[PDB]
Amino acid sequence: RRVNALEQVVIPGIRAQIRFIQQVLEQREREDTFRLKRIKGKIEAREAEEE
């Protein structure tokens, strides 16, 4: 009973939480990349238009 419970309820649940956390972290990474691209664009615009 304990083996079945661990193999069916516990481990898949922990795996699902791991997947969810990974997805959230990857989302935050993508947003940070977007922000960095915008910052670089602004820097280039200022430098190339009015120094």
Binding site: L36, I39, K40, K42, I43, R46, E51
Partner: protein, 578 residues
């Protein structure tokens, strides 16, 4: 000098135009009020100035005047028993001049110019003096304050003032080339003070906390980091170190933390006793306070001021403990400034040079041979405040790569009021092997073996906890259950320490050694009894268990008798069990 006008204002950042010729990291007076600022970017005719004071009310066109010098501190007699702001301004003088609030543009000398000091010369005319040599002696709270030659000054002595009372502005020594040496000199806070040679770590920095002094020791010239979430004990640990450590001089840097925590020191330390000199504890303490609601640009300045003062007192031949209440606030201030600079940020918005700055700050510690030939040391204990308790954040990881000891605090332990709440699994110390000869000479010949036995017992308990969380403690065998119970005893009776208890606040090395010896003797007797069928359920009910549990609260001078009686009872109780 270079004199410009304000072109743009946005928070702590001011852009001044007409500043061609100004140098980087020079100090500037901003506005008609002469607010102290620092140049951090040069671009054509303009200079980017971060202001160490509030900028509300400033207007475009106000003058900006460069002093042509970087940020510097006055190093001399009069720094002990005092509290300073981020840029080394005495807060008592500000309170006298301003009131209960801190206003802008207050100009006060770091060292009092009116107080007289009993000068005692040591050099004579014609002597060749070099950087770091001792020119004379001045008494300060039972210390012998040494008037050092500035590190970059050489020459031959032309004349010396005779013994008497003088202010710090008096030119006590005049060299042949005409330069006048005073009781104090200035030093740029961003330049590390030179030393003759670095030394290997061989003596411990006794913190007075059992877990830190035994399991994760830090050497006298070493560096330690204590990260943790909010409420985990970082401030209480650092203040316990300031109260109880065996350092001659303590420099406490309150970088971006609560002002009530600085008030705590200011109120309590004068009434406490220095562990070695016998006088008031505040006489050996220097406080640098830049609270969280003080200007953000001054946090880095406060850190550098503290480290420079620590280096100066090391150069005088003392062993100095430096406590940085939070380097995370310094990192946040750097991020705030980089936001105004519109730089491209590194991970989590911090500027890329954050790791270089942290490494440069932490590398200033160490036991050295001073330029004057004496031996001094600086010990740095920096607290880290990761956001959300996430130890994977850039500042914590950067600090992990340079410190010798890592004291990780655990939120779960703090929730259950288990203090100092050190996460034993996540903590480590790299000074353990180098300090073993000192332990053998000064504590006991077998002290390292006892410490290793305790560490092995904790590792075994950590291994068994995985099974315990799976099947429960009652499913183990008697030997494994004994390991679990002995680990609980170690955690509750040895690792735990109440910083606010009248006795348990400080622990000597020999008292900790005695507690470890009692615990290990009890464990050995229990394993012997278990090996001959004695039930564990009755071993745990022995009153000697309570005796070991309460051995923490026994005073130092009463402890040896208590330890002898406890050892006798340990032998007798297990003799009684068949």
């Amino acid at each position: 000098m270079i004199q410009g006008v304000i072109q743009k204002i946005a928070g702590p950042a001011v852009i001044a135009k007409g500043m061609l010729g100004a140098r980087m990291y020079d100090i500037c007076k901003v506005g008609e009020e002469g607010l102290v600022g620092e140049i951090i970017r040069l671009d054509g005719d303009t200079a980017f100035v971060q202001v160490y004071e509030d900028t509300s009310g400033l207007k475009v066109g106000e003058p900006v005047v460069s002093t042509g010098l970087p940020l510097a501190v006055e190093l001399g007699p009069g720094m002990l028993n005092g509290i300073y702001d981020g840029i080394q301004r005495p807060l008592e003088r500000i309170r006298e001049k301003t009131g209960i609030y801190i206003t802008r543009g207050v100009v006060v000398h770091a060292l009092d110019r009116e107080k007289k000091w009993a000068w005692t010369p040591m050099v004579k005319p014609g002597d060749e003096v070099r950087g770091g040599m001792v020119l004379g002696t001045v008494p300060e709270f039972g210390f012998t304050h040494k008037i050092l030659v500035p590190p970059d000054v050489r020459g031959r002595v032309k004349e010396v003032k005779p013994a008497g009372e003088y202010t710090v502005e008096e030119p006590v020594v005049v060299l042949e080339d005409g330069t006048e040496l005073k009781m104090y000199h200035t030093w740029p806070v961003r330049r590390a003070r030179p030393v003759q040679r670095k030394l290997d770590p061989n003596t411990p920095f006794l913190t007075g906390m059992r877990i830190l002094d035994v399991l994760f020791p830090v050497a006298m010239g070493g560096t330690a980091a204590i990260p943790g979430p909010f409420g985990s004990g970082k401030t209480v640990t650092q203040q316990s170190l300031a109260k109880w450590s065996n350092a001659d001089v303590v420099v406490y840097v309150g970088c971006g933390e609560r002002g009530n925590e600085m008030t705590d020191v200011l109120v309590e330390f004068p009434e406490l006793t220095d562990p070695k000199t016998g006088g008031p504890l505040m006489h050996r303490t220097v406080l640098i306070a830049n609270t969280s609601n003080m200007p953000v640009a001054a946090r880095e300045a406060s850190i550098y001021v503290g480290v420079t003062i620590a280096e100066y007192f090391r150069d005088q031949g003392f062993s100095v403990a430096l406590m940085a209440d939070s380097t995370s606030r310094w990192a946040e201030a750097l991020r705030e400034i980089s936001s105004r600079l519109e730089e491209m940020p590194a991970e989590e918005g911090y500027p890329p040079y954050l790791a270089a700055r942290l490494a440069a700050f932490y590398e200033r510690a160490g036991k050295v041979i001073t330029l004057g030939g004496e031996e001094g040391a600086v010990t740095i204990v920096g607290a880290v405040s990761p956001p959300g308790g996430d130890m994977s954040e850039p500042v914590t990881q950067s600090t992990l790569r340079i410190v010798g000891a890592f004291w990780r605090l655990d939120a779960s332990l703090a929730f259950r009021r288990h203090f100092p709440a050190i996460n034993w699994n996540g903590s480590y110390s790299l000074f353990t092997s180098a300090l073993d000869p000192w332990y053998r000479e000064n504590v006991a010949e077998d002290y390292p073996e006892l410490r290793d036995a305790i560490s092995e017992l904790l590792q075994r308990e950590a291994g068994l906890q995985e099974i315990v969380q799976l099947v429960g403690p009652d499913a183990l065998q008697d030997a494994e259950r004994l390991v679990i119970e002995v680990g609980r005893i170690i955690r509750e009776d040895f690792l735990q320490q109440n910083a606010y208890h009248e006795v348990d606040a400080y622990c000597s090395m020999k008292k900790a050694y005695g507690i470890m010896k009692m615990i290990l003797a009890f464990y050995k007797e229990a394993e012997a009894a278990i090996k001959r069928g004695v039930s564990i359920d009755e071993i745990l009910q022995l009153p000697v268990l309570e005796r070991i549990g309460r051995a923490r609260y026994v005073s130092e001078e009463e402890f040896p008798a208590y330890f002898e009686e406890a050892m006798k009872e340990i032998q007798g109780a297990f003799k009684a069990l068949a």
